A paper describes a structure:
Toll-like receptors (TLRs) play an important role in the innate immune response. Receptors belong to the type I of membrane proteins and contain the large extracellular ligand-binding domain, single-pass transmembrane domain, and globular intracellular Toll-interleukin receptor homology ([name]) domain. In particular, [name] is shown to form the heterodimers with TLR2, which are activated upon the binding of lipoteichoic acid or cysteine-containing lipopeptides. The overall fold of the resolved structure is typical for the [name] domains: five α-helices and a five-strand β-sheet.
We undertook several attempts to crystallize the [name]-[name]/Zn complex. The best crystal diffracted to 1.9 Å and was used for the structure solution. In our hands, the protein was as well crystallized with the disulfide bonds, being formed in the presence of TCEP agent, whereas no disulfide bonds were observed in several weeks after the sample preparation for the soluble fraction of [name]-[name] in solution under the similar conditions. It is noteworthy that crystal growth was essentially slow and took several months, and all the reducing agents have a limited lifetime.
Author numbering: 624 to 782
The structure:
Amino acid sequence: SNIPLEELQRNLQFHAFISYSGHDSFWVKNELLPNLEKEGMQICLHERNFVPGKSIVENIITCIEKSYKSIFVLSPNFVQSEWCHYELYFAHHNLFHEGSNSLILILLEPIPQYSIPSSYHKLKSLMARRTYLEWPKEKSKRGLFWANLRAAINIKLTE
């Protein structure tokens, strides 16, 4: 029982775009994607829905524009291999307005401060909010994680 995309104002094709580092593919493909897709959600996926003949940036932007929410799978891997795309793009476009709930942050793995370049200002800003969902190491708290996550996807967008 998720959001019916057709009932929305914009012409959206996906409930969520999932941005992740290829190094985190096992958890994304065996945990994140099944729990969202077995619920009936439509997911725009890094490299799975990307179109040939376009740059990776254009493919990412296309997923974002066609998705109700965007999910970043934060981790040291994501910082090192994926975040630069967004730091560069956010420097010229207010794609996600500070205060809007269109962007969902999953802290899959804690990110040490030394691994964050000083020039990743937008990343430090987003994580200073402390509004991300932490993947719990304790198995008994993973039901809470999935419930929180599905709620973050289905919550009404900030006006």
